[PDB]
């Protein structure tokens, strides 16, 4: 039962609430290490916890790799977004983070630490504003500002540190020295004046991807991403990822989960309790699979429950009810199907002859109220009303699950095993266009006209 419940606070093997807010993760040896920070009673840096696991679901407490006692300036300060990266050359784990006074946010500087072991007590080095010696001034103080940050290890073995500079208006990608403990140069300035925060830098197939969020404090916002063949330049524009609130969370880190089957990228987020007036320690987590439609097209679906099998390297949706179904039209006798039995995103939904194919099988996931999710089997995508249309003739397609109301359907029994499937968005029924009785009939959205082409029978398979 390697299943995770989003919008909650995961508990370690001890039965205690895990506290690794704004943290990250590292895969070394046979274990996945989850680092993160958490405040205390005075809302100040208490320690950077570390959790270990092989299955990515059951986490074991390993103590504070970094404490407010590790250094004199760590006593009264704010530390957030601690990330850990490994150095093959040295053989030591270097840790970066964001440091503040604890009184204000004027000292926008980064901090560094390291240890010979992953779950061992890290030794604090220093806190500083990148390029301090260069003499450059960034808003009153010497050295570039450095708030929200993150680390990245490239294939060639070069380390990289990214953070928000120039009053969170610009993103600075710093290239680290071979030891990872220092900054060698300013690789490139990314997304100037666009004000992107909580950056996550990853790589897949010669393509670099940068997942960022907006700057609105606790308030969840529209997350975005970009791609490029080179870190220095060639970066694309910003493309929306997830919904308008990133499913009520803010991105913190993204790691490739490699296994026997293949590689599945995991998304980590934070549901900051500050949204509803709660303390930082009351923040919950949101883990979702990061799917790659193409080298240039990304998908971030929302599953209320996610199943993970680290061994095989597979991250998919958890269906509470594996019962398969077929939707037969009263008028045509055809069943609900996907065009060309495609698994592509936004694939057109059509009616087709009952051929017992996978494309013609659907799950029914309750999503609160009297509404449900109609999910295809051959492709984990959900039945969706294209472009959240509220008009007659609105085409129906299969789209990535995003909790939108245009993906919620209520079944209304009319007798004899037939139902009227209305959308939660406008209330229009699932309709076979023009009363079509042939294969490939476009499935659409239409007002309840009492037609038999709008009536569907639910059949077990
Ligand atoms: O009014 C709100 C908002 O609605 C968006 O509708 C989008 C969503 O319904 C989304 C799933 O929730 O599905 C989008 O379908 C898009 C399609 O529009 C585009 O042409 O192709 C992509 C991928 O192929 C995808 O299928 C749908 O657009 C509107 O998009 C948005 O403008 C806004 O109106």
Short mmCIF file of C-alpha atoms and ligand atoms in Angstrom, two decimals:
data_model
loop_
_atom_site.label_atom_id
_atom_site.label_comp_id
_atom_site.label_asym_id
_atom_site.label_seq_id
_atom_site.Cartn_x
_atom_site.Cartn_y
_atom_site.Cartn_z
CA UNK A 1 0.00 0.00 0.00
CA UNK A 2 2.51 2.60 -1.19
CA UNK A 3 -0.18 5.28 -1.33
CA UNK A 4 0.10 8.96 -0.38
CA UNK A 5 -2.70 11.35 0.60
CA UNK A 6 -2.18 14.94 -0.58
CA UNK A 7 -3.32 18.01 1.35
CA UNK A 8 -2.19 16.43 4.62
CA UNK A 9 0.88 16.11 6.84
CA UNK A 10 2.69 12.82 6.18
CA UNK A 11 3.69 10.82 9.25
CA UNK A 12 7.04 9.05 9.75
CA UNK A 13 7.38 5.43 10.88
CA UNK A 14 7.34 6.66 14.48
CA UNK A 15 3.80 7.96 14.03
CA UNK A 16 4.84 11.59 14.25
CA UNK A 17 4.06 14.44 11.85
CA UNK A 18 6.91 14.96 9.37
CA UNK A 19 8.36 18.48 9.50
CA UNK A 20 10.43 19.25 6.39
CA UNK A 21 8.84 22.40 4.97
CA UNK A 22 10.27 23.97 1.81
CA UNK A 23 12.71 21.07 1.76
CA UNK A 24 14.15 18.93 -1.01
CA UNK A 25 15.36 15.39 -1.70
CA UNK A 26 18.48 13.48 -2.72
CA UNK A 27 18.94 9.95 -4.05
CA UNK A 28 22.19 8.41 -2.79
CA UNK A 29 22.98 4.71 -2.57
CA UNK A 30 19.82 2.78 -1.72
CA UNK A 31 17.96 5.57 0.08
CA UNK A 32 16.03 8.73 -0.74
CA UNK A 33 16.85 11.51 1.71
CA UNK A 34 14.26 14.19 2.45
CA UNK A 35 15.60 17.41 3.98
CA UNK A 36 13.65 20.44 5.17
CA UNK A 37 13.31 23.14 7.81
CA UNK A 38 10.77 24.05 10.48
CA UNK A 39 10.29 26.98 12.85
CA UNK A 40 9.68 26.90 16.59
CA UNK A 41 7.51 28.89 19.02
CA UNK A 42 9.02 32.23 17.99
CA UNK A 43 8.68 31.39 14.30
CA UNK A 44 12.46 31.20 13.96
CA UNK A 45 14.87 28.62 12.53
CA UNK A 46 14.91 25.60 14.84
CA UNK A 47 16.49 22.89 12.69
CA UNK A 48 16.78 21.26 9.28
CA UNK A 49 15.27 17.79 9.67
CA UNK A 50 16.24 14.76 7.59
CA UNK A 51 14.10 11.75 6.70
CA UNK A 52 15.24 8.54 5.00
CA UNK A 53 13.30 5.98 2.93
CA UNK A 54 13.58 3.44 0.11
CA UNK A 55 9.92 3.30 -0.87
CA UNK A 56 9.26 7.06 -0.73
CA UNK A 57 6.16 6.50 1.41
CA UNK A 58 7.41 5.31 4.80
CA UNK A 59 9.86 7.86 6.20
CA UNK A 60 12.32 7.37 9.05
CA UNK A 61 13.50 10.16 11.36
CA UNK A 62 17.25 10.80 11.25
CA UNK A 63 17.57 13.89 13.43
CA UNK A 64 18.61 17.45 12.62
CA UNK A 65 21.51 17.53 10.16
CA UNK A 66 21.55 21.24 10.95
CA UNK A 67 20.52 22.96 14.18
CA UNK A 68 20.25 26.49 15.55
CA UNK A 69 23.26 25.41 17.62
CA UNK A 70 25.45 24.50 14.63
CA UNK A 71 26.60 28.13 14.39
CA UNK A 72 26.44 31.44 16.33
CA UNK A 73 24.42 33.26 13.66
CA UNK A 74 21.99 30.33 13.41
CA UNK A 75 20.68 31.04 16.91
CA UNK A 76 18.40 33.95 15.98
CA UNK A 77 17.56 33.75 12.28
CA UNK A 78 15.27 32.50 9.51
CA UNK A 79 16.31 29.54 7.38
CA UNK A 80 14.11 28.33 4.55
CA UNK A 81 14.33 26.16 1.44
CA UNK A 82 17.37 24.06 2.37
CA UNK A 83 18.55 21.89 -0.51
CA UNK A 84 21.17 19.14 -0.56
CA UNK A 85 23.40 18.10 -3.46
CA UNK A 86 26.10 15.43 -3.75
CA UNK A 87 29.65 15.84 -5.06
CA UNK A 88 31.18 12.82 -6.80
CA UNK A 89 34.69 14.28 -6.73
CA UNK A 90 34.93 15.20 -3.05
CA UNK A 91 32.47 12.61 -1.76
CA UNK A 92 30.78 15.06 0.60
CA UNK A 93 27.23 16.39 0.67
CA UNK A 94 27.02 20.16 0.18
CA UNK A 95 23.94 21.97 1.51
CA UNK A 96 22.59 25.36 0.42
CA UNK A 97 19.76 27.48 1.84
CA UNK A 98 18.24 30.93 2.37
CA UNK A 99 19.32 32.97 5.40
CA UNK A 100 17.69 35.99 7.09
CA UNK A 101 18.04 38.02 10.29
CA UNK A 102 14.92 36.70 11.98
CA UNK A 103 13.99 40.34 12.52
CA UNK A 104 13.53 41.26 8.86
CA UNK A 105 14.38 40.24 5.29
CA UNK A 106 17.07 42.81 4.47
CA UNK A 107 19.99 40.39 4.61
CA UNK A 108 19.08 38.45 1.47
CA UNK A 109 21.97 36.00 1.58
CA UNK A 110 22.64 32.30 0.96
CA UNK A 111 24.17 29.88 3.46
CA UNK A 112 26.32 26.78 2.98
CA UNK A 113 27.11 23.62 4.94
CA UNK A 114 28.45 20.11 4.34
CA UNK A 115 29.01 16.63 5.76
CA UNK A 116 30.82 13.40 4.89
CA UNK A 117 27.53 11.54 5.39
CA UNK A 118 23.98 12.40 4.21
CA UNK A 119 22.20 11.96 7.55
CA UNK A 120 25.14 13.17 9.62
CA UNK A 121 25.55 16.45 11.50
CA UNK A 122 26.38 19.13 8.94
CA UNK A 123 29.04 21.73 9.71
CA UNK A 124 27.96 25.30 9.01
CA UNK A 125 30.37 27.35 6.91
CA UNK A 126 29.12 30.86 6.21
CA UNK A 127 26.27 33.03 4.96
CA UNK A 128 26.84 35.57 2.20
CA UNK A 129 25.44 37.54 -0.71
CA UNK A 130 26.82 36.04 -3.97
CA UNK A 131 29.50 38.11 -5.73
CA UNK A 132 30.22 40.23 -2.63
CA UNK A 133 33.87 40.73 -3.53
CA UNK A 134 33.01 41.83 -7.08
CA UNK A 135 31.87 45.05 -5.41
CA UNK A 136 28.47 45.05 -7.10
CA UNK A 137 25.69 46.70 -5.09
CA UNK A 138 22.18 45.27 -4.99
CA UNK A 139 19.68 47.54 -3.22
CA UNK A 140 21.84 49.15 -0.54
CA UNK A 141 24.12 46.24 0.31
CA UNK A 142 27.19 44.68 -1.36
CA UNK A 143 26.56 41.43 -3.23
CA UNK A 144 23.54 40.06 -5.08
CA UNK A 145 20.41 39.40 -3.05
CA UNK A 146 19.60 35.71 -2.61
CA UNK A 147 16.23 34.58 -1.27
CA UNK A 148 14.24 31.61 -2.60
CA UNK A 149 16.85 29.16 -3.84
CA UNK A 150 17.54 25.66 -5.16
CA UNK A 151 20.39 23.42 -6.31
CA UNK A 152 21.06 21.35 -9.42
CA UNK A 153 23.71 18.85 -10.50
CA UNK A 154 24.31 18.66 -14.24
CA UNK A 155 25.40 15.57 -16.19
CA UNK A 156 28.94 16.90 -16.68
CA UNK A 157 29.28 17.10 -12.90
CA UNK A 158 29.02 20.89 -12.65
CA UNK A 159 27.10 22.19 -9.65
CA UNK A 160 24.59 25.03 -9.90
CA UNK A 161 22.88 27.32 -7.39
CA UNK A 162 19.80 29.36 -8.30
CA UNK A 163 18.05 32.07 -6.28
CA UNK A 164 15.85 35.16 -6.58
CA UNK A 165 17.88 38.38 -6.79
CA UNK A 166 17.19 42.07 -7.39
CA UNK A 167 14.22 42.20 -5.00
CA UNK A 168 12.86 38.84 -6.17
CA UNK A 169 12.48 40.40 -9.62
CA UNK A 170 15.24 38.38 -11.29
CA UNK A 171 16.49 34.79 -11.10
CA UNK A 172 20.23 34.28 -10.80
CA UNK A 173 21.81 30.98 -11.85
CA UNK A 174 25.21 30.72 -10.20
CA UNK A 175 27.82 28.19 -11.30
CA UNK A 176 29.58 26.58 -8.34
CA UNK A 177 33.27 25.79 -7.98
CA UNK A 178 34.26 22.10 -8.30
CA UNK A 179 33.81 21.69 -4.52
CA UNK A 180 30.20 22.93 -4.63
CA UNK A 181 30.89 24.99 -1.49
CA UNK A 182 31.57 28.26 -3.33
CA UNK A 183 30.34 30.34 -6.28
CA UNK A 184 32.55 30.32 -9.38
CA UNK A 185 30.52 32.65 -11.60
CA UNK A 186 27.14 34.05 -12.63
CA UNK A 187 25.97 31.57 -15.26
CA UNK A 188 23.01 33.63 -16.47
CA UNK A 189 20.20 35.99 -15.48
CA UNK A 190 16.83 34.35 -16.10
CA UNK A 191 13.37 35.86 -16.50
CA UNK A 192 14.28 39.45 -15.67
CA UNK A 193 11.54 41.65 -14.22
CA UNK A 194 9.12 38.72 -14.39
CA UNK A 195 9.38 38.06 -10.65
CA UNK A 196 9.45 34.26 -10.39
CA UNK A 197 9.97 32.47 -7.07
CA UNK A 198 10.49 28.96 -5.67
CA UNK A 199 12.53 27.82 -8.71
CA UNK A 200 13.16 24.14 -9.44
CA UNK A 201 15.88 23.25 -11.94
CA UNK A 202 15.88 19.81 -13.58
CA UNK A 203 17.08 18.03 -16.72
CA UNK A 204 15.68 15.21 -18.85
CA UNK A 205 16.79 14.63 -22.45
CA UNK A 206 19.32 17.36 -23.19
CA UNK A 207 16.54 19.71 -22.09
CA UNK A 208 16.70 21.91 -19.00
CA UNK A 209 13.37 22.66 -17.32
CA UNK A 210 12.73 25.47 -14.83
CA UNK A 211 9.59 25.18 -12.71
CA UNK A 212 8.79 28.44 -10.93
CA UNK A 213 5.90 29.98 -9.01
CA UNK A 214 4.48 33.47 -8.58
CA UNK A 215 5.26 36.02 -5.89
CA UNK A 216 2.22 36.32 -3.64
CA UNK A 217 3.41 35.31 -0.19
CA UNK A 218 1.42 32.45 1.32
CA UNK A 219 -1.30 32.68 -1.34
CA UNK A 220 -1.03 29.80 -3.81
CA UNK A 221 -0.67 31.01 -7.40
CA UNK A 222 -0.24 29.99 -11.04
CA UNK A 223 2.94 27.93 -11.41
CA UNK A 224 4.87 28.06 -14.69
CA UNK A 225 7.77 26.36 -16.47
CA UNK A 226 10.29 26.90 -19.26
CA UNK A 227 12.84 24.89 -21.25
CA UNK A 228 16.19 25.26 -23.00
CA UNK A 229 18.95 23.17 -24.58
CA UNK A 230 21.58 25.23 -22.74
CA UNK A 231 21.67 26.79 -19.26
CA UNK A 232 23.45 29.93 -20.45
CA UNK A 233 20.81 30.97 -23.00
CA UNK A 234 18.08 29.72 -25.32
CA UNK A 235 15.39 29.71 -22.64
CA UNK A 236 11.78 29.69 -23.81
CA UNK A 237 8.78 31.65 -22.55
CA UNK A 238 6.71 30.80 -19.48
CA UNK A 239 4.05 28.11 -19.88
CA UNK A 240 1.33 27.52 -17.28
CA UNK A 241 1.65 24.41 -15.14
CA UNK A 242 -1.23 22.98 -13.11
CA UNK A 243 -4.20 25.23 -12.34
CA UNK A 244 -4.43 28.82 -11.10
CA UNK A 245 -3.29 27.86 -7.60
CA UNK A 246 -1.03 24.91 -8.39
CA UNK A 247 -3.61 22.81 -6.53
CA UNK A 248 -3.25 24.97 -3.43
CA UNK A 249 0.52 24.61 -3.03
CA UNK A 250 3.92 26.08 -3.93
CA UNK A 251 6.68 24.10 -5.72
CA UNK A 252 9.72 23.19 -3.63
CA UNK A 253 11.65 20.48 -5.48
CA UNK A 254 11.52 17.93 -8.32
CA UNK A 255 13.54 14.71 -8.44
CA UNK A 256 13.77 11.91 -11.02
CA UNK A 257 12.59 8.63 -9.51
CA UNK A 258 14.40 5.93 -11.46
CA UNK A 259 13.39 2.28 -11.35
CA UNK A 260 13.08 -0.94 -13.35
CA UNK A 261 10.23 0.22 -15.59
CA UNK A 262 11.70 3.65 -16.30
CA UNK A 263 12.01 7.12 -14.82
CA UNK A 264 9.18 9.13 -13.26
CA UNK A 265 9.72 12.72 -12.11
CA UNK A 266 8.19 13.52 -8.72
CA UNK A 267 6.84 16.96 -7.82
CA UNK A 268 7.03 18.23 -4.25
CA UNK A 269 5.03 21.17 -2.93
CA UNK A 270 4.04 23.00 0.21
CA UNK A 271 0.53 23.85 1.34
CA UNK A 272 1.62 26.69 3.62
CA UNK A 273 -0.70 26.95 6.62
CA UNK A 274 -0.26 30.71 6.36
CA UNK A 275 -3.02 30.62 3.75
CA UNK A 276 -5.62 30.04 6.47
CA UNK A 277 -3.80 31.87 9.28
CA UNK A 278 -1.86 28.91 10.67
CA UNK A 279 1.74 28.57 11.85
CA UNK A 280 4.41 27.34 9.42
CA UNK A 281 4.66 24.03 11.29
CA UNK A 282 1.04 23.32 10.37
CA UNK A 283 1.89 23.22 6.66
CA UNK A 284 0.89 20.18 4.60
CA UNK A 285 2.49 18.53 1.56
CA UNK A 286 1.37 17.90 -2.01
CA UNK A 287 3.18 15.29 -4.10
CA UNK A 288 2.25 14.76 -7.75
CA UNK A 289 3.78 13.10 -10.83
CA UNK A 290 5.40 15.38 -13.41
CA UNK A 291 4.50 13.98 -16.83
CA UNK A 292 6.26 14.82 -20.10
CA UNK A 293 3.94 14.91 -23.11
CA UNK A 294 6.88 16.10 -25.20
CA UNK A 295 10.36 17.55 -24.74
CA UNK A 296 8.61 20.93 -24.90
CA UNK A 297 5.23 20.06 -23.36
CA UNK A 298 4.78 19.34 -19.64
CA UNK A 299 1.83 18.12 -17.58
CA UNK A 300 1.19 18.34 -13.84
CA UNK A 301 -2.01 16.46 -12.94
CA UNK A 302 -3.67 16.52 -9.52
CA UNK A 303 -4.48 13.19 -7.87
CA UNK A 304 -6.15 13.33 -4.45
CA UNK A 305 -4.22 10.12 -3.77
CA UNK A 306 -0.96 9.11 -5.43
CA UNK A 307 0.50 5.61 -5.64
CA UNK A 308 4.28 5.24 -5.80
CA UNK A 309 6.49 2.24 -6.54
CA UNK A 310 10.07 3.49 -6.29
CA UNK A 311 11.39 0.04 -7.20
CA UNK A 312 9.79 0.12 -10.65
CA UNK A 313 10.04 3.90 -10.92
CA UNK A 314 6.33 4.46 -11.51
CA UNK A 315 4.21 7.32 -10.16
CA UNK A 316 0.51 7.22 -11.01
CA UNK A 317 -2.98 7.89 -9.66
CA UNK A 318 -4.54 5.77 -6.92
CA UNK A 319 -8.06 4.61 -7.78
CA UNK A 320 -10.12 3.75 -4.64
CA UNK A 321 -12.45 1.64 -6.80
CA UNK A 322 -10.84 -0.45 -9.55
CA UNK A 323 -14.26 -1.44 -10.92
CA UNK A 324 -14.30 -1.04 -14.72
CA UNK A 325 -17.33 0.26 -16.66
CA UNK A 326 -18.76 0.71 -20.16
CA UNK A 327 -21.03 3.59 -21.16
CA UNK A 328 -23.58 2.44 -23.73
CA UNK A 329 -25.72 4.97 -25.59
CA UNK A 330 -29.46 4.24 -25.61
CA UNK A 331 -30.01 5.51 -29.15
CA UNK A 332 -26.93 4.23 -31.00
CA UNK A 333 -26.00 1.19 -28.92
CA UNK A 334 -22.40 2.38 -29.23
CA UNK A 335 -20.12 2.90 -26.24
CA UNK A 336 -18.07 5.86 -25.00
CA UNK A 337 -14.58 5.65 -26.49
CA UNK A 338 -11.44 7.60 -27.37
CA UNK A 339 -10.67 8.55 -30.98
CA UNK A 340 -8.16 6.09 -32.46
CA UNK A 341 -7.93 4.63 -28.97
CA UNK A 342 -5.35 7.35 -28.38
CA UNK A 343 -3.67 8.06 -25.05
CA UNK A 344 -2.65 11.53 -26.21
CA UNK A 345 -3.75 14.54 -24.18
CA UNK A 346 -6.90 16.36 -25.29
CA UNK A 347 -7.86 13.39 -27.47
CA UNK A 348 -11.35 13.63 -28.96
CA UNK A 349 -14.06 11.50 -27.34
CA UNK A 350 -16.21 9.50 -29.77
CA UNK A 351 -18.77 6.70 -29.67
CA UNK A 352 -17.73 3.30 -30.99
CA UNK A 353 -18.93 -0.29 -31.36
CA UNK A 354 -18.52 -2.34 -28.19
CA UNK A 355 -15.26 -4.15 -28.94
CA UNK A 356 -14.11 -4.75 -25.37
CA UNK A 357 -11.10 -2.51 -25.92
CA UNK A 358 -9.22 -0.69 -23.16
CA UNK A 359 -10.10 2.69 -24.63
CA UNK A 360 -13.76 1.85 -23.93
CA UNK A 361 -13.30 1.16 -20.20
CA UNK A 362 -13.73 3.77 -17.47
CA UNK A 363 -13.25 4.08 -13.71
CA UNK A 364 -15.56 6.13 -11.47
CA UNK A 365 -13.78 8.10 -8.76
CA UNK A 366 -15.98 9.90 -6.24
CA UNK A 367 -14.81 13.49 -5.75
CA UNK A 368 -17.26 14.79 -3.16
CA UNK A 369 -20.94 15.62 -3.42
CA UNK A 370 -22.93 13.63 -5.96
CA UNK A 371 -20.27 14.14 -8.62
CA UNK A 372 -17.60 11.78 -9.91
CA UNK A 373 -14.54 11.55 -12.14
CA UNK A 374 -14.82 9.51 -15.32
CA UNK A 375 -11.29 8.25 -15.92
CA UNK A 376 -10.17 6.30 -18.98
CA UNK A 377 -8.30 3.03 -18.41
CA UNK A 378 -5.89 2.87 -21.36
CA UNK A 379 -4.92 6.44 -20.43
CA UNK A 380 -5.24 7.79 -16.89
CA UNK A 381 -6.80 10.96 -18.27
CA UNK A 382 -10.25 12.15 -17.22
CA UNK A 383 -13.36 13.05 -19.22
CA UNK A 384 -13.18 16.81 -19.67
CA UNK A 385 -15.27 19.53 -21.31
CA UNK A 386 -12.84 21.25 -23.68
CA UNK A 387 -11.96 24.80 -22.59
CA UNK A 388 -14.47 24.73 -19.74
CA UNK A 389 -17.13 25.52 -22.32
CA UNK A 390 -20.66 26.37 -21.19
CA UNK A 391 -22.20 26.30 -24.67
CA UNK A 392 -24.19 23.69 -26.60
CA UNK A 393 -22.04 21.61 -28.93
CA UNK A 394 -19.09 21.86 -26.57
CA UNK A 395 -16.75 19.04 -27.58
CA UNK A 396 -15.79 16.44 -24.97
CA UNK A 397 -12.19 15.28 -24.68
CA UNK A 398 -9.86 13.39 -22.35
CA UNK A 399 -7.58 15.74 -20.41
CA UNK A 400 -5.13 15.66 -17.51
CA UNK A 401 -6.89 15.57 -14.14
CA UNK A 402 -6.93 19.08 -12.68
CA UNK A 403 -9.88 19.03 -10.28
CA UNK A 404 -11.78 21.39 -12.57
CA UNK A 405 -15.58 21.29 -12.44
CA UNK A 406 -15.57 20.54 -16.16
CA UNK A 407 -14.27 17.12 -15.12
CA UNK A 408 -16.93 16.35 -12.51
CA UNK A 409 -20.03 14.40 -13.55
CA UNK A 410 -23.26 13.56 -11.75
CA UNK A 411 -25.29 10.46 -12.66
CA UNK A 412 -29.08 10.82 -12.58
CA UNK A 413 -31.04 7.55 -12.67
CA UNK A 414 -33.95 7.69 -15.14
CA UNK A 415 -34.75 3.98 -14.86
CA UNK A 416 -33.91 0.67 -16.54
CA UNK A 417 -30.22 1.19 -15.85
CA UNK A 418 -29.90 4.40 -17.85
CA UNK A 419 -28.58 7.73 -16.59
CA UNK A 420 -28.31 11.41 -17.53
CA UNK A 421 -24.68 12.43 -17.01
CA UNK A 422 -24.62 16.18 -16.32
CA UNK A 423 -21.52 18.35 -15.91
CA UNK A 424 -20.89 20.17 -12.64
CA UNK A 425 -19.85 23.31 -14.51
CA UNK A 426 -23.08 24.17 -16.35
CA UNK A 427 -25.32 21.11 -15.99
CA UNK A 428 -25.46 20.11 -19.66
CA UNK A 429 -25.58 16.40 -20.48
CA UNK A 430 -23.13 14.15 -22.32
CA UNK A 431 -24.47 14.13 -25.87
CA UNK A 432 -23.88 12.21 -29.09
CA UNK A 433 -23.62 14.93 -31.74
CA UNK A 434 -26.53 15.02 -34.20
CA UNK A 435 -27.97 11.77 -32.82
CA UNK A 436 -25.19 9.98 -34.70
CA UNK A 437 -25.50 6.19 -34.90
CA UNK A 438 -22.19 5.48 -36.63
CA UNK A 439 -18.63 4.88 -35.43
CA UNK A 440 -16.65 8.01 -34.62
CA UNK A 441 -19.69 9.97 -33.49
CA UNK A 442 -18.49 13.09 -31.71
CA UNK A 443 -19.36 13.09 -28.01
CA UNK A 444 -20.27 16.61 -26.89
CA UNK A 445 -22.11 18.77 -24.37
CA UNK A 446 -25.76 19.69 -24.77
CA UNK A 447 -28.81 20.83 -22.81
CA UNK A 448 -31.10 18.16 -21.38
CA UNK A 449 -33.47 17.74 -24.33
CA UNK A 450 -34.82 14.38 -23.20
CA UNK A 451 -33.37 12.71 -26.26
CA UNK A 452 -32.28 9.08 -26.17
CA UNK A 453 -28.91 10.16 -27.55
CA UNK A 454 -28.31 11.72 -24.13
CA UNK A 455 -29.09 8.57 -22.14
CA UNK A 456 -26.32 6.17 -21.10
CA UNK A 457 -26.31 2.73 -19.49
CA UNK A 458 -23.60 1.80 -16.98
CA UNK A 459 -22.25 -1.72 -17.63
CA UNK A 460 -19.73 -3.70 -15.54
CA UNK A 461 -16.78 -5.42 -17.24
O1 LIG B 1 -12.06 30.26 -18.82
C1 LIG B 1 -11.12 29.57 -18.03
C2 LIG B 1 -10.06 28.94 -18.93
O2 LIG B 1 -10.59 27.79 -19.55
C3 LIG B 1 -9.61 27.08 -20.26
O3 LIG B 1 -10.09 25.82 -20.76
C4 LIG B 1 -9.03 24.89 -20.74
C5 LIG B 1 -9.30 23.85 -19.66
O4 LIG B 1 -10.62 23.37 -19.78
C6 LIG B 1 -8.33 22.68 -19.79
C7 LIG B 1 -8.64 21.60 -18.76
O5 LIG B 1 -9.19 22.19 -17.60
O6 LIG B 1 -8.41 22.13 -21.08
C8 LIG B 1 -7.96 23.04 -22.06
O7 LIG B 1 -7.88 22.44 -23.37
C9 LIG B 1 -6.72 22.91 -24.01
C10 LIG B 1 -7.08 23.49 -25.37
O8 LIG B 1 -7.80 24.69 -25.20
C11 LIG B 1 -5.83 23.75 -26.20
O9 LIG B 1 -6.21 24.19 -27.49
O10 LIG B 1 -5.08 22.57 -26.32
C12 LIG B 1 -4.57 22.15 -25.07
C13 LIG B 1 -3.61 20.98 -25.27
O11 LIG B 1 -3.85 20.40 -26.54
C14 LIG B 1 -5.72 21.77 -24.15
O12 LIG B 1 -6.38 20.63 -24.67
C15 LIG B 1 -8.91 24.24 -22.11
O13 LIG B 1 -8.42 25.18 -23.04
C16 LIG B 1 -9.11 27.93 -21.43
O14 LIG B 1 -8.07 27.25 -22.10
C17 LIG B 1 -8.61 29.29 -20.95
O15 LIG B 1 -8.39 30.13 -22.05
C18 LIG B 1 -9.61 29.93 -19.99
O16 LIG B 1 -10.72 30.39 -20.73
#
